[PDB]
Amino acid sequence: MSRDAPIKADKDYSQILKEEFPKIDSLAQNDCNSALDQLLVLEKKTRQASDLASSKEVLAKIVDLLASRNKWDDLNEQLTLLSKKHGQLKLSIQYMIQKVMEYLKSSKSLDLNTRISVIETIRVVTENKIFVEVERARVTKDLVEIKKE
Amino acid sequence: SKMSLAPEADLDSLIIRNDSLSGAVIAAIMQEAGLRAVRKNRYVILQSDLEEAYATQVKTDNTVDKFDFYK
Amino acid sequence: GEITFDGIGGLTEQIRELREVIELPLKNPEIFQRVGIKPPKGVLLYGPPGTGKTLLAKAVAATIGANFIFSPASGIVDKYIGESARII
Amino acid sequence: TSIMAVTFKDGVILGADSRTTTGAYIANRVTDKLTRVHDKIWCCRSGSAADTQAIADIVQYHLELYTSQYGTPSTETAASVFKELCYENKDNLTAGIIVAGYDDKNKGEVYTIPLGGSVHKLPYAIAGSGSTFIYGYCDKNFRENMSKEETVDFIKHSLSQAIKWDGSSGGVIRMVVLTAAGVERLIFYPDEYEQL
Amino acid sequence: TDRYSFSLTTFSPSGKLGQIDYALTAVKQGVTSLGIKATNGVVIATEKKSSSPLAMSETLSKVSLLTPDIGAVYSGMGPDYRVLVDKSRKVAHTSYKRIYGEYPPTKLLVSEVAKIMQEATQSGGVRPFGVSLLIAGHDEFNGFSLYQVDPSGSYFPWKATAIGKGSVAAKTFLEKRWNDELELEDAIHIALLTLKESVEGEFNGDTIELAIIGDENPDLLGYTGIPTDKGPRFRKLTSQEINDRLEAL
Amino acid sequence: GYDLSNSVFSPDGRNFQVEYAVKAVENGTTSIGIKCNDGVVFAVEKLITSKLLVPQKNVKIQVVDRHIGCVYSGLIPDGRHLVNRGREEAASFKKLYKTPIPIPAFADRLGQYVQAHTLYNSVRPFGVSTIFGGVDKNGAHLYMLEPSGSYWGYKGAATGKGRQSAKAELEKLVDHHPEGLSAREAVKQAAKIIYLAHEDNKEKDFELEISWCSLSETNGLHKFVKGDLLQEAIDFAQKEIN
Amino acid sequence: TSILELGQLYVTMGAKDKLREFIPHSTEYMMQFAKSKTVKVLKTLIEKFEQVPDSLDDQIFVCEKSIEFAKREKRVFLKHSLSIKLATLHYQKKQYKDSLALINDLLREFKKLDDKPSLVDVHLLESKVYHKLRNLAKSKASLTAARTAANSIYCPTQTVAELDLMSGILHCEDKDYKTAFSYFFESFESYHNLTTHNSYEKACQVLKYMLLSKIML
Amino acid sequence: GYDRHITIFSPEGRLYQVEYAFKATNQTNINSLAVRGKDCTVVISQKKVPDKLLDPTTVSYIFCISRTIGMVVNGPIPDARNAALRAKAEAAEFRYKYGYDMPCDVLAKRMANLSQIYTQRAYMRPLGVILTFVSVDEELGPSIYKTDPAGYYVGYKATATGPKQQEITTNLENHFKKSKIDHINEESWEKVVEFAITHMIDALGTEFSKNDLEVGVATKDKFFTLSAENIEERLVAIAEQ
Amino acid sequence: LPNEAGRLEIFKIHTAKVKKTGEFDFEAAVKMSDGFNGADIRNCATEAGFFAIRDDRDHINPDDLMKAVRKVAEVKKLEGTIEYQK
Numbered sequence A: 001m002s003r004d005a006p007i008k009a010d011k012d013y014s015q016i017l018k019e020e021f022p023k024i025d026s027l028a029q030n031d032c033n034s035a036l037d038q039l040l041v042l043e044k045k046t047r048q049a050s051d052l053a054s055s056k057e058v059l060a061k062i063v064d065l066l067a068s069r070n071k072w073d074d075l076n077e078q079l080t081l082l083s084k085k086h087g088q089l090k091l092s093i094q095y096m097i098q099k100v101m102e103y104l105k106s107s108k109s110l111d112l113n114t115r116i117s118v119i120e121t122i123r124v125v126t127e128n129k130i131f132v133e134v135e136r137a138r139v140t141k142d143l144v145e146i147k148k149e
Numbered sequence B: 001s002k003m004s005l006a007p008e009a010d011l012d013s014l015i016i017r018n019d020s021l022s023g024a025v026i027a028a029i030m031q032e033a034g035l036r037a038v039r040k041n042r043y044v045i046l047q048s049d050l051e052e053a054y055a056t057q058v059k060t061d062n063t064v065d066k067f068d069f070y071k
Numbered sequence C: 001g002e003i004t005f006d007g008i009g010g011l012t013e014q015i016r017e018l019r020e021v022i023e024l025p026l027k028n029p030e031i032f033q034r035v036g037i038k039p040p041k042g043v044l045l046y047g048p049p050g051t052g053k054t055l056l057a058k059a060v061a062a063t064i065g066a067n068f069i070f071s072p073a074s075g076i077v078d079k080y081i082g083e084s085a086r087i088i
Numbered sequence D: 001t002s003i004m005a006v007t008f009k010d011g012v013i014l015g016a017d018s019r020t021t022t023g024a025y026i027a028n029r030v031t032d033k034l035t036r037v038h039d040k041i042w043c044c045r046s047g048s049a050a051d052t053q054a055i056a057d058i059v060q061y062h063l064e065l066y067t068s069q070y071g072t073p074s075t076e077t078a079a080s081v082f083k084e085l086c087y088e089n090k091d092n093l094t095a096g097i098i099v100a101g102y103d104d105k106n107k108g109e110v111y112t113i114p115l116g117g118s119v120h121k122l123p124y125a126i127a128g129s130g131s132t133f134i135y136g137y138c139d140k141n142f143r144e145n146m147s148k149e150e151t152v153d154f155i156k157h158s159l160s161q162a163i164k165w166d167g168s169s170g171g172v173i174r175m176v177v178l179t180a181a182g183v184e185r186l187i188f189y190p191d192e193y194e195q196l
Numbered sequence E: 001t002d003r004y005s006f007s008l009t010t011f012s013p014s015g016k017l018g019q020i021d022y023a024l025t026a027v028k029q030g031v032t033s034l035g036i037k038a039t040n041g042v043v044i045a046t047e048k049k050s051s052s053p054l055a056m057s058e059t060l061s062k063v064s065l066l067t068p069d070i071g072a073v074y075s076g077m078g079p080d081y082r083v084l085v086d087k088s089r090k091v092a093h094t095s096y097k098r099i100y101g102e103y104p105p106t107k108l109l110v111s112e113v114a115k116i117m118q119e120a121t122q123s124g125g126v127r128p129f130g131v132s133l134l135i136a137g138h139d140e141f142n143g144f145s146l147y148q149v150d151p152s153g154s155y156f157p158w159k160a161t162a163i164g165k166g167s168v169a170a171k172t173f174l175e176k177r178w179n180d181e182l183e184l185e186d187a188i189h190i191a192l193l194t195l196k197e198s199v200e201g202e203f204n205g206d207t208i209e210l211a212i213i214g215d216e217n218p219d220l221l222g223y224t225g226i227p228t229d230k231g232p233r234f235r236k237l238t239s240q241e242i243n244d245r246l247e248a249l
Numbered sequence F: 001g002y003d004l005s006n007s008v009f010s011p012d013g014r015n016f017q018v019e020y021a022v023k024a025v026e027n028g029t030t031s032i033g034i035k036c037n038d039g040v041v042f043a044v045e046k047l048i049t050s051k052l053l054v055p056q057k058n059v060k061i062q063v064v065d066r067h068i069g070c071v072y073s074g075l076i077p078d079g080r081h082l083v084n085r086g087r088e089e090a091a092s093f094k095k096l097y098k099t100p101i102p103i104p105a106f107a108d109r110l111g112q113y114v115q116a117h118t119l120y121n122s123v124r125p126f127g128v129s130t131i132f133g134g135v136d137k138n139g140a141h142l143y144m145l146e147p148s149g150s151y152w153g154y155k156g157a158a159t160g161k162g163r164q165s166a167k168a169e170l171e172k173l174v175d176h177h178p179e180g181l182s183a184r185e186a187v188k189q190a191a192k193i194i195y196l197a198h199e200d201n202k203e204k205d206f207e208l209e210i211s212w213c214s215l216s217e218t219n220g221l222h223k224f225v226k227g228d229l230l231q232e233a234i235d236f237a238q239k240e241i242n
Numbered sequence G: 001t002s003i004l005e006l007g008q009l010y011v012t013m014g015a016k017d018k019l020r021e022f023i024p025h026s027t028e029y030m031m032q033f034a035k036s037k038t039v040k041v042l043k044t045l046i047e048k049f050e051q052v053p054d055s056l057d058d059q060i061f062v063c064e065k066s067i068e069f070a071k072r073e074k075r076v077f078l079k080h081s082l083s084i085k086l087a088t089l090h091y092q093k094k095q096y097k098d099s100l101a102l103i104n105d106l107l108r109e110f111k112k113l114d115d116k117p118s119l120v121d122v123h124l125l126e127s128k129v130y131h132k133l134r135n136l137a138k139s140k141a142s143l144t145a146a147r148t149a150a151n152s153i154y155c156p157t158q159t160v161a162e163l164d165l166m167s168g169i170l171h172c173e174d175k176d177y178k179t180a181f182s183y184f185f186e187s188f189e190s191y192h193n194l195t196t197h198n199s200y201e202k203a204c205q206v207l208k209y210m211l212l213s214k215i216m217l
Numbered sequence H: 001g002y003d004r005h006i007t008i009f010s011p012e013g014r015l016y017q018v019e020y021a022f023k024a025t026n027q028t029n030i031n032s033l034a035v036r037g038k039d040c041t042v043v044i045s046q047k048k049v050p051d052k053l054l055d056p057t058t059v060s061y062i063f064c065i066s067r068t069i070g071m072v073v074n075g076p077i078p079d080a081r082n083a084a085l086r087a088k089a090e091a092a093e094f095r096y097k098y099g100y101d102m103p104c105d106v107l108a109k110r111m112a113n114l115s116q117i118y119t120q121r122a123y124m125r126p127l128g129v130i131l132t133f134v135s136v137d138e139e140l141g142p143s144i145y146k147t148d149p150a151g152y153y154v155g156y157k158a159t160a161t162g163p164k165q166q167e168i169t170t171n172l173e174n175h176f177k178k179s180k181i182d183h184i185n186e187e188s189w190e191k192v193v194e195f196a197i198t199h200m201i202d203a204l205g206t207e208f209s210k211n212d213l214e215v216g217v218a219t220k221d222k223f224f225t226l227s228a229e230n231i232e233e234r235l236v237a238i239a240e241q
Numbered sequence I: 001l002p003n004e005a006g007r008l009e010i011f012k013i014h015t016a017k018v019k020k021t022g023e024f025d026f027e028a029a030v031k032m033s034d035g036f037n038g039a040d041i042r043n044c045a046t047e048a049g050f051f052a053i054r055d056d057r058d059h060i061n062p063d064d065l066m067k068a069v070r071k072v073a074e075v076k077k078l079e080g081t082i083e084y085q086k
C-alpha cells in the first residue's frame, strides 16, 4: 500500500531464480518438493504482474510432475491451494489453469489421470466465474470424449 | 408474479425496511433487480440481485426509518 | 464528434453500466423474457460538466450504428405553445 | 511501617509489611500496602493511611487516561504525579510513597517521594518509621544487579530486622515482583523470617 | 459570549405555545403505551421495536423503575425518555429520601418531574423532552394512582389511559372494558388485547413488554425479617410469563 | 443556507464554512514536512514581497516545548494563536508528568481545540493547517492538522498553494526510499521541493527557511538550520530547477 | 387449579354419555366460585366440548346456557365471544334459519359498541350461511365487508386464512378460477403452516380446491 | 422557519438536525462488522489507506477506552477523537468514584445521555459519530451496545455500521437463524474472527488486505488489536475453510 | 468528475493523440495537480503545446507538460464546482 519495496523485490528474485532455473530443475529430480519451495515465495507477494511472471517458472517445473504418472496428484493439490489463498488477485492463476491443459494433451497421459485432474479443475472453478468460464467449457469437453467410450 | 425468482428472495421482509415508497418505485426496484441479475448472467431473480437494487433509487428522507430514535 | 467504444477514460465503469440498459435489450429483448421484467427503458445522466455525458452519447451512436438523434438545447423551443410539443 | 523497593538485573522487587498501628491498637495486620495504580507500576504506602490512599486513587485515575491517549507511563512518569499532588498539599497532607515499576526500556526503577513532595531516583529506597533502623544494613549488603532469588532474600532479611526494631511494622512480609516475567506476589509468614 | 439565554419557546399569535405543539407531534411518532388501573393493582404495557433484527429486545427497556413501588413508561422519543427518567430518579432521592428518608408519594413525584419539564421550556439551550410518560404507582397515602405527564409540564390523574400514536384507538377500546371494579387478572387480559390492535409487530411476550404494579412482593425486597417493611409493588414479567397470559385471553 | 453557522448542518453530511476555511489555507504560503527515519525536516516558503522586508526575521516556525517544531500555512495570525494555545498545553504536561509532551499527545490536544470551534457559534472556525512533528522516545513523527481538526501520521505532507509540485515528488521520494532517507539527506530534499513549489509562486521571489528535529543531527531537539549548512541546501535546490 | 384440571378430565376422554351430561352442569360448578376469572376458563371449557362431536342438541345447549351467565354479572367481551361460538355451532347442525337470525342480531348492536375485531369473524360466518342458502349476491356483499375490515392490521393468521378460504369458494361459483386459485394458495399455506390440531383437515380441503381450479382452466 | 438550523422540533415530530448526523457517517465510507463469540467479541473494520504518504499504523478508528472496552467509530475523524476522549474520561471517572471498571452497558448509556444533551443545545452541535462498544464483561458476558448521535442505544447480537451495512445485516441474520442462539459458539477467538470476515466479504463483495482491515478483539478481561501480520494470517485461513 | 486515476486513464489516450519524445511519467504529477475534469486533460495537452511553442518544438516533452498541468490547475481554482447529487 504505502510501500513499493514489494514490487521491486518480486521482479529481482524472479530474475535471479529464472537464471537459477536450471540449477532448480536438476534439484527437482533429487527432491521436487525442495525445488518447488524456492518458487512459492515469489507468488506470496502482492504484485499480480510479477506473480504472473513467476507463475511461468512453476508451469515449466510442473512438466516433471505431469510427465510422471504419480506426481500429478500433488499438482492437483497445488492448484486448489493457490486459487483459494488469494488468487494472487485472479490474473495469475488464469494463465496457470490454461497451461496445464495443453501439457496433458502432448504427454499422452492415461484416461484415468486425465479424468481425475480435470475433475479437480472443475470442482474448484465451479462457483468462480471471474474468467474461468472461458477455459472451463473446453476443460469439460475433454472429459466428454472419454465418457462416450 | 410478473418476474421469475429463486425462492431465496423474500418479498415480505422488504416491507418494513422502507415505508415511504410509491408503487412505481416498487416497479423500479424489481426492474433493476432484473438488471443486476443480467450482470451475473442469471435469469432468475436472486436475493443478491434484489437487495442490491433495493438499496439504491429509494433515497434517504427525513420521514424514513433509516434514521429512527422516535420510537 | 464520434469516438471509440472507450473514449472517456476512467468513466469506463459508467459505459458498461450504460450498455446494460441500452444495448443488451436492443440486440435481444428475448433474454429479458426469461427474467420477466418490464423492458429496461430510460437513463438519466448527471454530473459536473466536462465529464463527457454527451461525448459518451456520440460513442454509443457510432459503436452501435443504430438510428440516432439528438436534439439542440433550445432550438426545439418555438414561439408557439403546443407547437413546440408537436415537433418533439 | 516499613516499605522499600530495590532494583535488581531483571526488574524491581517490592517489599512491605501489613501492620497498621492507630495508637497501640493495630487496626489491621493483614492489610496490603502494595497498591496497584497501574498494571506494571505499583506503589508502597506509608504515613497517614488515608492521605496516601486518596492520592493513589487520583494517580490511578490519571494514569488510566494517560495510557489510553498518550502512551504508557514509565516509572518516572508515575512518580511525578505523586510528587505534584504532594507539593500542593505539603502543608495539609503527609504521605510517604515509594513508587516502583519495571519499564522494558530503562528497566526496573525506584523513585521515592518524601512527605513534602519531591522525587529522587535511587537504586533502592527505604521509607516508613521502621526503615530508619535498617538503613546501614541496607546500604552495606545491597549489591547492584543481584539474582531474583538473592533480591527476595535480601529484602526479607532487611525487613526482619525492621520488624525486630519497630513495633509499628510486623505481620507478614508481602512482596510484589515487577519484571518482564509478570507480576508475582510472594508472602512470608513470620516463622519463616524470625529465623532468616 | 454565548448569548443564548432567551427562551426557544414563544407564544403563537392565535394562542398556544408553538414549541410544545411540535413536541406533541413527536409523541405521535413514538410507540404505543397504556395503563389500566385496577382496584387491586395497575397494569402498564408497551410495545417493543428495534432498529435492527440483530438488536436484542431482552436488553431493551422502555419501562423503568423510579422507585420500587412506582414505574414509568413512555411514548415518544427514546433519547428524550432516557435522560429524563434518570432525572426523575434523581429528584425522588435528593428531595424526599434525603429529607423525608423514604420513597416519595406518586402524586408528589409526578409534580416534581413537571418542574423539570417546565424549565426545559424556559431559557435558551434547552427544548422540552418530546415524550408523555405514564407514571403508575402505589403510595400509602393516595392509594393506587395512574398519571399522565405531558410535554407541556402538566399532569392529570386517570382511571385508564393511553399514549402514543395509537392512543385514540386504545382509549376508545378501553371505554367499554373499564368497570368500577376490576380484577388484576382481567386488567392484564384487557391490556394485551388493547395493545394487539395498536401493535404492528409480533404479539408474542418477547416483543410485548408487560409490567404490573399489582400486589407487593417481599421476596424481591432483598431482605426479610422486618414484616413491617414491604417489598417492590412493581414486578416486570419476563417473556415466558407474558406468553402464558396470551393464551389466557 | 447551511453556512450561516456551524450548528447548521446540510443533508450532504458536510459543513461548508469548514470546507470554505480550507480555501484560506490554499491561499497561504507553501509549507512542507518530510518524515525522515530519524527526524523531520520542515521547510517553508517566505515570500519577498518587497525589498523592504528583513530576511530570516519573520518566523513562521515557532517551537513548542523544545523538540516539536510547528510551521503552518494559511492565516498567519490564526496559526500563531493556535500555537500559543498549544504552548500552554505543553507546559501543563511538563508540569504534571515531569516529561516533555509526546508527538501523538500534542496532536490530540491541538485537535480537540480546533474540533471545538467547528461546533460553537460563539467561537469562529480555524483557517489554518499546521505541519508539526518531532522526535521523542516513541520515534520520529510528522502530523498534519486540518482546520476541520483531522490529523494522521504521514510519510510526507504539504499544504499551501504549491503543494501540487511538493506532493507529487514525495511519491517519488518514497519510491526512492521505501525505508526513508537520512536526516542529512532530507536537508537538501526539503530545500529542493520548495524550489520546485516556487512554480506555483513564480510571480514573486522567496527566502528559504529550514528547521529540523532529528536524533542524529541535533539529538532529537528542534533547532534552526542556519549558516553555511542552510546555504548549502539553497545551492543544491537552486540547481535542480535550473 | 380446580376448574382447570376438571376440563382436562373432560377433554381426555372420548364422546361419552357422562361427558355430555357433565357440561351444562359444569357451568353451575363455574358460577359456584363467584370469581371473575371464570371468563378465561369458560371460553376454553366450551372450546374443548366442541372439538370432539357430542350430539346435536347438547353442544348448542351447553353454549346457550353459558351465554346467559356471560351477561348475568360478566363482561360484554365474554358474552360476544360465546355468541361467535354459538353461531358456528348452529351452522354445523345445519340450521341456517337459526344461524342467519342470530347473525343479523349480533352484528348490528356491536356497531354502537364497535371497537371489535371480532366482527370480522361475524362477517365470515355470515358469508358461509348465505352460500349454503345458495345466494351469492349477499355472500359476496358480506365477504367484501370482511376483506375491508381485515385490511386494518390486527388480524391473526387464522383470521386471514378464513377470509381467503371463503373468498376462493365464492369465486368458483362465479365461474372464475383464476381469482379463486390465487386465494387458495395463500389459504393453503396458512393452514399448512398453522400447527395441526384441526388444521390437517382443512389443509386437505384447500389443496383439493387449488387443484379443481386448474382442471376448469 | 428554522427547524433545520437549530435543534427545535418540526411539525413532523422529528428533529432534522439530528437526522443529518446519521448522513455524515456514510461519507467517510468506513464499514464495521461486530459479532459476539463464546469468549470474545470481535470487531473488524475497514481501514482506508488512500495514498502512499499516509502511514497506515497511525490511521485509527479503534480507540481503546478502558482496559477491557474497545470502541470503533463510524463517521468523521474529528468527532471520533472528541468522542473517544470523552468516553475515556467518563470511564476513568467511574473507576475512580465507584471503585471498579465501567461496564459496557453503562458506558453506552453515559455517552447516549451526553449525545442527547448535544441535541438539546442549539450552540453545541451533536457529534456525528455512531459509536460501537465491544467488550467481554463478566456481568453480561460478551456484549455489544451501539450508541448513535441521537442518544439511542440498544443491545445487539451482532451489528454493522456504514453505508452498505444493510447488506451485512442479512448475512448475520441468517447465521443466527441456523444456530438458534444469539451468539456464535466457537471457543477459539481466532475462528470467530474468521467467521466475522466471511460475513463482511459476502456483504461488500470485496476481498481484503491486511492494511484494508484493522481488527480489534475483546477476549475475557482484555482488549487488544491485531497487528498487520496477524490479520494476514486470518485472511489466509478464510481459504482454509 | 474523473477520479484521481481516472484523470490518468485519459492521460494515456490523449498522449497518443500528440507527438512526443517519450512521456510515461504521468502518474504522480496529475494525481497531485487534481481539480481537473475530463475536458481539462485535453487543455493540459494543448497548453503543453504552448510551452512547446515558446521553446520552438513540435513535440510534447515532459518538460513542456509538467509546467502545463501546474498552470491548467491554477486557473481552475477560480470557482468551485460544488454539487450535491442523489
Ligand SMILES: Nc1ncnc2c1ncn2[C@@H]1O[C@H](COP(=O)(O)OP(=O)(O)OP(=O)(O)O)[C@@H](O)[C@H]1O
Pocket: C001, C007, C008, C009, C048, C049, C050, C051, C052, C053, C054, C055, I010, I038, I039, I042
Ligand atoms: N471526458 C472527456 N475526455 C476527453 N475530452 C473531453 C472529455 N470531456 C469533455 N471533453 C472535451 O470537451 C468537449 C465538450 O465537452 P462535452 O460537451 O462532451 O461535455 P459534457 O460533460 O456533456 O458537459 P455539459 O454537462 O455542460 O453538457 C468534447 O467534445 C471534448 O473535446
Ligand SMILES: [Mg+2]
Pocket: C053, C054, C055
Ligand atoms: Mg455536453
